[PDB]
């Protein structure tokens, strides 16, 4: 494969879709390959105070995201993570702000926004020193374990694990801090992937920059239960940010996901073809955080 660069350079699209009437934003994207198409779920917010979730109809190419039907979910699954859990031939949708810290549901047809099972507990722990509590889960498995990573809007990244044979189920109520920094440097939206062709995992984490602009920092590990090493960890030399995105429609490069080689729990990405589906917003936007007009965009790594 292709080693991660020490300096990332991207090109970007503009906004790839506008929210369906009634929503002010589309956020926190999760995306899988599904029958040769892209299947995307997202957080929504309306014009008042309501968070929700949605999926898009599957679409073939990124120009079709703008016209793909946007399907409200009748059960809100904010900041979702979608994947196929191969060992039990079942799809899993993990999320937050349900009945415990994190939740999940299952389905045999992930294109159906309303086909998910009743809510199941994914994590029932609490964390110290956090205004939000646990936020922005992500999940990944290797040959023997499933792993849960999450943030706390507090400078820490947390990890829990279970034997893969016990999944789907709850990770319990305890977690291990695997990294800590200032609140702004390890803020939220972690995503963890296996790099195809390398004995290496990639973690990206959203950070808040010096003028409030959102960007991503990257870290690597050789084992999911091992230590993380800074890979691109400043605003001027980020994994992805205003410094290197090639995007003018947005300064923020915020909560999203890399395009994967598989839908399943191995969370594999091709380091020769990194692409980031992120949320961005017009630099002229402002006002209360919850009403910010986020939209999807796509970065393609230059090589
Ligand atoms: O979009 C809802 C939440 O806002 C942000 O703080 C999070 O990354 C996400 O969990
Ligand atoms: Ca996420």
From TrEMBL:
Disulfide linkages recorded for this protein, renumbered to the chain, are 2-272
One GO biological process this protein is involved in is: xylan catabolic process
Keyword terms, alphabetized: Calcium, Carbohydrate metabolism, Glycosidase, Hydrolase, Metal-binding, Polysaccharide degradation, Secreted, Signal, Xylan degradation
Kindly state which reaction or reactions the protein catalyses.
Hydrolysis of terminal non-reducing alpha-L-arabinofuranoside residues in alpha-L-arabinosides
Organism superkingdom: Bacteria
Task: List GO molecular-function terms, semicolon-separated.
Answer: alpha-L-arabinofuranosidase activity; metal ion binding
Q: What class of enzyme is it?
A: hydrolase
Q: Does the keyword Transport apply?
A: no
Look up the record and report any one GO term of the cellular component aspect: extracellular region
The answer to whether keyword Iron applies is no
What protein am I looking at? non-reducing end alpha-L-arabinofuranosidase
Species in which this protein is naturally found: Streptomyces thermoviolaceus
Gene behind the chain: stxIV
């Amino acid at each position: 494969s292709c080693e991660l660069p020490s300096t990332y350079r991207w090109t970007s699209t503009g906004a790839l879709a506008q929210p369906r009437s009634g929503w002010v934003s589309l956020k926190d994207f999760t995306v899988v390959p599904y029958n040769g198409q892209h299947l995307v779920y997202a957080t929504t917010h309306d014009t008042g105070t309501r968070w929700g979730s949605m999926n898009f109809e599957p679409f073939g190419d990124w120009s079709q995201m703008a016209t793909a039907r946007q399907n409200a979910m009748n059960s809100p699954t904010v900041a979702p993570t979608l994947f196929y859990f191969a060992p039990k031939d079942i799809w899993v949708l993990a999320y937050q702000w349900g009945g415990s810290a994190f939740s999940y549901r299952t389905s045999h047809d992930p294109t159906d926004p309303n086909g998910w099972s009743s809510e199941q507990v994914l994590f029932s722990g609490s964390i110290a020193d956090s205004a939000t509590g646990p936020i922005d889960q992500t999940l990944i498995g290797d040959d023997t374990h499933m792993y849960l990573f999450f943030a706390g809007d507090n400078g820490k990244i947390y990890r829990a694990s279970m034997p893969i044979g016990d999944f789907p189920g709850s990770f319990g109520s305890t977690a291990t801090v695997v990294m800590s920094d200032t609140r702004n440097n390890l803020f939220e939206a972690p995503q963890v992937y296996k790099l195809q062709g390398q004995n290496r995992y990639l973690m990206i984490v959203e950070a808040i920059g010096a003028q409030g602009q959102r960007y991503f920092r990257s870290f690597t590990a050789t084992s999911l239960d091992g230590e993380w090493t800074p890979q691109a960890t400043s605003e001027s030399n980020p994994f992805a940010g205003k410094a290197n995105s090639g995007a003018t429609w947005t300064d923020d490069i915020s909560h999203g996901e890399l395009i994967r080689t598989t839908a399943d729990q191995t969370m594999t990405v091709d380091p020769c073809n990194l692409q980031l589906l992120y949320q961005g917003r017009d630099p002229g936007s402002g006002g209360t955080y919850d009403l910010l007009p986020y939209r999807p965009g796509l970065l393609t790594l230059q090589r």
